[PDB]
Amino acid sequence: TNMLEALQQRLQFYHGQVARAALENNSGKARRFGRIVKQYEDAIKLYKAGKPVPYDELPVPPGFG
Amino acid sequence: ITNLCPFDEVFNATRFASVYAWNRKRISNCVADYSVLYNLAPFFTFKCYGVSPTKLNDLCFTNVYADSFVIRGDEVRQIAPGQTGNIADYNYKLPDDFTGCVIAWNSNKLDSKVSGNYNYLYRLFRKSNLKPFERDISTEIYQAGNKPCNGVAGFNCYFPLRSYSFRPTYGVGHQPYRVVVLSFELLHAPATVCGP
Numbered sequence A: 001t002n003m004l005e006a007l008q009q010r011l012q013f014y015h016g017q018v019a020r021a022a023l024e025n026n027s028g029k030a031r032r033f034g035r036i037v038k039q040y041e042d043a044i045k046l047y048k049a050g051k052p053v054p055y056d057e058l059p060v061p062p063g064f065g
Numbered sequence B: 001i002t003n004l005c006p007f008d009e010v011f012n013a014t015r016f017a018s019v020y021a022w023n024r025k026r027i028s029n030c031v032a033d034y035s036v037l038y039n040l041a042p043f044f045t046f047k048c049y050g051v052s053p054t055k056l057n058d059l060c061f062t063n064v065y066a067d068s069f070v071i072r073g074d075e076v077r078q079i080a081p082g083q084t085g086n087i088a089d090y091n092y093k094l095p096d097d098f099t100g101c102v103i104a105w106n107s108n109k110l111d112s113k114v115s116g117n118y119n120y121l122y123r124l125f126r127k128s129n130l131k132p133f134e135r136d137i138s139t140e141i142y143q144a145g146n147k148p149c150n151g152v153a154g155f156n157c158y159f160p161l162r163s164y165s166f167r168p169t170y171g172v173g174h175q176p177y178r179v180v181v182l183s184f185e186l187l188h189a190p191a192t193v194c195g196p
């Protein structure tokens, strides 16, 4: 499963979280989730460029299966 | 009848409904002066279907429905009969036969906070495309994969809808555009929304 599918999976899950936070009218939660999405898209861009992907630097994912 | 139609109210709304839950407004028992749209709104895209704008100010309608939502500028072209796309297939669908107008204008000043805007929402994942002039406000988790989940999770379930992140820094393509769609039927049998 390597890294690319997992990265897109986390990206989609956190996009859904951002959308849910926006739907709940929560401001700070939406902003923080959007920032997390920003770092995750930076990380996936870095991995696509060939640079190594980290584990602890990025926030931990939920109970993915 | 002489009372004016509430076009100013719908064109001057503080916030437009999200495209996945596009607002539907009834306009009836009033005189509709469309010269307001031409005189005001310096920036607009009034390209209309089934009737010329001047003739539109001329003739008499009988059923006016106003649909309002927010669409990114790059994908504003998806609002048209017989045209595909994520917005057309998932959020708002126009029938192949269509007699009505579409108005679109940028709203970076109004609907893009300096830090960022997230109020507006749109749908990306669903099983089947929307039928014309049909609304879908369900938020059930998509069954993208072969694993039923009943709740949001990492694997191929996902959230059916997505949020925009409008900011003033974005270019004209990504900037939000306030889109309002008017629908007409010119059979004129009851003629309740007749013009001047």
Ligand SMILES: *[C@@H]1O[C@H](CO)[C@@H](O[C@@H]2O[C@H](CO)[C@@H](O)[C@H](O)[C@H]2NC(C)=O)[C@H](O)[C@H]1NC(C)=O
Residues within 6 Å of the ligand: B007, B008, B011, B012, B036, B040, B041
């Ligand atoms: C509210 O809508 C109206 C027209 O739909 C505009 O407000 C004024 O409308 C009159 C005509 O009735 C014009 O002469 C004025 O110039 C309009 N005001 C401004 C500031 O242009 C306008 O489109 C909307 N109001 C605002 C503040 O944008």
